[PDB]
Structure formats: C-alpha cells, structure tokens
Design goal:
Layout (H helix, E strand, L loop, with lengths): L3 E7 L13 E6 L6 E4 L7 E9 L4 E8 L5 E6 L9 E10 L5 E14 L4 E7 L9 E5 L2 E2 L5 E2 L8 E6 L3 E2 L7 E13 L7 E9 L21
Antiparallel strand pairs: 1-2, 1-16, 2-3, 4-5, 4-15, 5-6, 7-13, 7-14, 7-16, 8-9, 8-12, 8-15, 10-13, 11-12
The structure holds manganese (II) ion.
Manganese (II) ion binds next to strand 1 and strand 2.
Protein name: Lectin
Family: Belongs to the leguminous lectin family.
GO molecular function, one term: metal ion binding
C-alpha cells in the first residue's frame, strides 16, 4: 500500500469518536485519523492560501491556512519523517467532493526541497499559471487544466476525485545526510452556492509509484483506501 504524509483541509462530517466537530486543518501520518488538528474557518467564494514546512533537525511539521484580511489558523506535529517516508518521494495535491455543487480550483503552487550531505542539493518549482497540456504534472482521476490557466482538481459542470503530482522524484533523505528540509505553498478557490459544503483538499507526499486507491473518495481525500 502507499505511504502517505499529508496536510488536509477537511469539511466532511467526521464520524469517529475523538474527531473535530468542525471544518478543520489537520496533519496526517499514514492514516486518515489526523495526528493534530485546528479549526478551519472556511470561506467559499474567497481565495485561500496554505503554507507547509519541515526540517530534519527541528523535526516539526507545521502548516498555516489563511484568507485575505482574516486571521490565520496553524497546526504543528512533532515527527521524524525519515522514520515514515522512503528516501525518494513524489509530492502532489488532491481533492474530493461530496454530494454538493462545488469546484476545487488551484491558482498557484510552489515547492522547495534541500538536502545536505559542498553547497546543498536542491529542487524548486513554481506554477503561477497552469498550461493546457502540462507535461511536468501527472494528472490522475478527474483533474485537468482549463483555458484560464487554472488547475481544476475535481469535475466542473458530484462525487469527484482528482490529483496532480510533480513529475520528478524528490530526494528527501540519504544515509550520509546532515539536514534536509522542504517548503510548499498553494492557493485555492472553492466556489459553491452553499456556504459550508462538504469538501476536501490536500498537499501530500508519497512513494513515487502512488496512485488513487480504490474506494478513496469523499472523506478519504483520494489518499487512503480505508479509515483505519
Ligand atoms: Mn479530517
């Protein structure tokens, strides 16, 4: 099975004892049951941004979500990712929709990874516009780029799932390493006639051969085959 680390924005009704009772941002380590959560004050119709960072010395994965002119929400979790992920990964974005009329539009996405064993080894990319046949993205499921230069992760006019992976593998650790780190950011627009629709969007890190697991729609965010 796939090895998943993710930052989720999640407004599906969460059913298990001990889950948040509100839309939330969370940090997921190999399971849908988040290791750490905070309230997500969701605003359909308005552009939002997520920032994510991690460093192998601090060993603290942190994320923040915010909207223009509003207060931001943060979440953090202490973890050694070398004990969880393989050395080579792929990074990506995912979204799912419930029985609602909503869009999951990504307007921009950038990423940086550094690895020190000599100046460091590194990789950086930024998409502020998405082109129509993007040969440096692996699109899975329903995901596609429209003619306005936007990345649409789920179907545009129910129950959709789609993902976009950066094409090249990322080197996040090696045995002779001093420190490694990564940063990511993306901006998103959730359009809907409803104010609080059940929806999901993630940034994630996986084994390089990852694909959409069978039965992973809705609350499993296109990342996990089951809730255990
Ligand atoms: Mn959740």
């Amino acid at each position: 099975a796939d090895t998943i680390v993710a930052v989720e924005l999640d407004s599906y009704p969460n059913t298990d004892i001990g889950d948040p009772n509100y839309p939330h941002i969370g940090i997921d380590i190999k399971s849908i049951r988040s290791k750490s959560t905070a309230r997500w004050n969701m605003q359909t119709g308005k552009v939002g941004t997520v920032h994510i960072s991690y460093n192998s010395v601090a060993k603290r994965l942190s994320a923040v979500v915010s909207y223009s002119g509003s207060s931001s929400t943060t979440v953090s979790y202490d973890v050694d990712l070398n004990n969880v992920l393989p050395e080579w990964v792929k990074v990506g974005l995912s979204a799912t929709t419930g029985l609602y009329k909503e869009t999951n539009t990504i307007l921009s996405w950038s990423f940086t990874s550094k690895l020190k064993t000599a100046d460091a080894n590194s990789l950086h990319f930024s998409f502020n516009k998405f082109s129509q046949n993007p040969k440096d993205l692996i699109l899975q499921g329903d995901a596609f780029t429209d003619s306005d230069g936007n990345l649409q992760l789920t179907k545009v006019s129910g129950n959709s799932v789609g993902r976009a992976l950066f094409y090249a593998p990322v080197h996040i650790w090696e045995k002779s390493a001093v420190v490694a780190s990564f940063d990511a950011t993306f901006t998103f627009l959730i359009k809907s006639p409803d104010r609080e629709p059940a929806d999901g969007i993630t940034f994630f890190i996986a084994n390089t051969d990852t694909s959409i697991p069978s039965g992973s729609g809705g609350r499993l965010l296109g990342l996990f085959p089951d809730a255990n």
